[PDB]
Chains A and B, each alone.
Chain A
Amino acid sequence: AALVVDNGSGMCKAGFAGDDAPRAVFPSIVGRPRHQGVMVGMGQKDSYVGDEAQSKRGILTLKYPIEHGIVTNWDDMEKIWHHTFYNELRVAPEEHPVLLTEAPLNPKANREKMTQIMFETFNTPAMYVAIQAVLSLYASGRTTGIVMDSGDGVTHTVPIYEGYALPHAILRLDLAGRDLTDYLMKILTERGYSFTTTAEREIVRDIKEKLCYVALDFEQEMATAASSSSLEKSYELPDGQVITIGNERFRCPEALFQPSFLGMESCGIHETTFNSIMKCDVDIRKDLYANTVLSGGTTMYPGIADRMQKEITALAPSTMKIKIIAPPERKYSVWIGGSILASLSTFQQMWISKQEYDESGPSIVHRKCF
């Protein structure tokens, strides 16, 4: 009975393979005990994880062991996984095969360490590591195409051939949902309100998620916002202030396409996507164009699909045919795709065996998982 464990920077999603949805989603945080003397305080333990670490925020030093998708502290991670198997799924990991996910371009040493911990520490009977984006592609039921994945810290463009990611043609953009949240913050402050603090960031994050959208034509929507209140929306604060958002609604995600809104010199997500395609094999450009799939929080903006559609059309050879696919469930793609893969009989044939480990050791990951 296989386990699926998708490790985001912010939320760990764990479940059983074949299930429609993770049977556990919890923040990816480790708390250690904070100055307070052993017993009185409350935390006698030297380690605390996830939601109970959240609820106990005071008297704890809270850490995120994952950063931009890449593991940052192997001591913490180990406790996330420890807590995932034991407190969250209530399972004995020595009894289950597990699929792990990893960021595109996860460095060699990290892949190896992930492998060592699973086997020497949790005594996994078998494991596999899959590129998050690849799983999102199966969740959409394709095997060829390019995934544009955007979460809170980083955006990636990952073209995929028959389920094989193509690492030479993967591009990383240091521009995701946070930069958007921070930008919205900034332009709401400029307008008259005053979001600057940590508590207020969360309010704004929520406004972003609730009222922002990508505009089909940026100039045109500006002119429509300038001449009409037709686009303005009102919003109900944690106190009782009700506020008005206009321009801001679509000026904020617009930075995904024009990163100079943020003082960045990068190209935007449309052009970063085309640049990936152009780096692939002439013979599959056709199928990537017509299989461009979006995933991650920052792709939930209404109109992002149509706009990607439009911007790729202009950059691409003119009689090519473009198709953006934006799964209504594209927030949860990665764990779903995982559940699809790890539930097949087939999976037995991909994974790394515990004995294979005993034989070849951690570097087996570079041979088997790609």
Chain B
Amino acid sequence: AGWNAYIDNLMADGTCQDAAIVGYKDSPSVWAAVPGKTFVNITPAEVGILVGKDRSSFFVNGLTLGGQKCSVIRDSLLQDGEFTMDLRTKSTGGAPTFNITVTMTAKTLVLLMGKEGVHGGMINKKCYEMASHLRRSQY
């Protein structure tokens, strides 16, 4: 139904455990996201840090998505023809961590979180291919 079609789509192959379309302009809000997971809770403050002009404090400070503490690996969110930020969660004591890609479109952020062991390059390519589709449609 509407944007939920995109989530359901991202999630179908079993390789991911969370996904989300988030409107970043004006008043940032989640458009669609997996229920009872992480990205569903993303705040507009968090969204402002992902897209704000400071591209370097979040290296040393880290950043949260939905209050989940994350570590940035590559930032090219604002770079033409790249459009991605790659992160990995941080956990306590041997508890698994997960790769995440956020891709920027004209109006949206597409977020995606792999299951344990899923490689960052696959999440990157999946997230980025979905974003493209959106971007092709003026989104």
Contact = CB atoms under 8 A, between A and B. Distances in A.
A370 B124 CA distance: 10
Interface stretch (A38-46, A166-174, A330-338): A166-174
B117 A346 contact: yes
Contacts of B61: 281-282
Interface in B47-89: 56, 59-62, 69, 71-75, 81-82, 84, 86, 88
A367 B71 contact: no
Contacts of B124: 367-368, 370
In the complex, which range does the number of interface residues on chain B fall in?
A: 20 to 34
B44 interface: no
Given A161-B73, A169-B59, A367 B128 contact: yes
Contact of B60 (A279, A346, A369): A279
Interface string A268-283: 0000000000011111
Interface string A308-352: 000000000000000000000000000000000000001001100
A367 B74 CA distance: 11
B84 to A, nearest CB: 8
Contacts of A349: 118-119, 122
B37 interface: no
A166 B125 contact: no
Q: Number of contact residues on A: which range applies?
A: 20 to 34
B122 A368 contact: yes
A229 to B, nearest CB: 51
A164 interface: yes
B114 to A, nearest CB: 11
Nearest to A352: B121
Contacts of A346: 117, 119
B97 interface: yes
Nearest to A169: B59
Contacts of A167: 74
B119 A280 contact: no
A282 B60 contact: yes
A193 B128 CA distance: 62
Given A283-B90, A370-B73, A370-B74, 12 more contacts: A161-B71, A166-B73, A168-B56, A280-B59, A280-B60, A281-B59, A281-B90, A346-B117, A350-B119, A350-B122, A367-B128, A368-B121
27 contacts: A161-B73, A162-B88, A162-B97, A164-B99, A164-B120, A168-B56, A168-B75, A169-B59, A281-B59, A281-B60, A281-B72, A282-B61, A282-B62, A283-B71, A283-B90, A284-B71, A346-B117, A350-B121, A350-B122, A364-B125, A367-B84, A367-B121, A367-B128, A368-B124, A368-B125, A370-B74, A370-B86
Interface of B: 56, 59-62, 69, 71-75, 81-82, 84, 86, 88, 90, 97, 99, 117-122, 124-125, 128
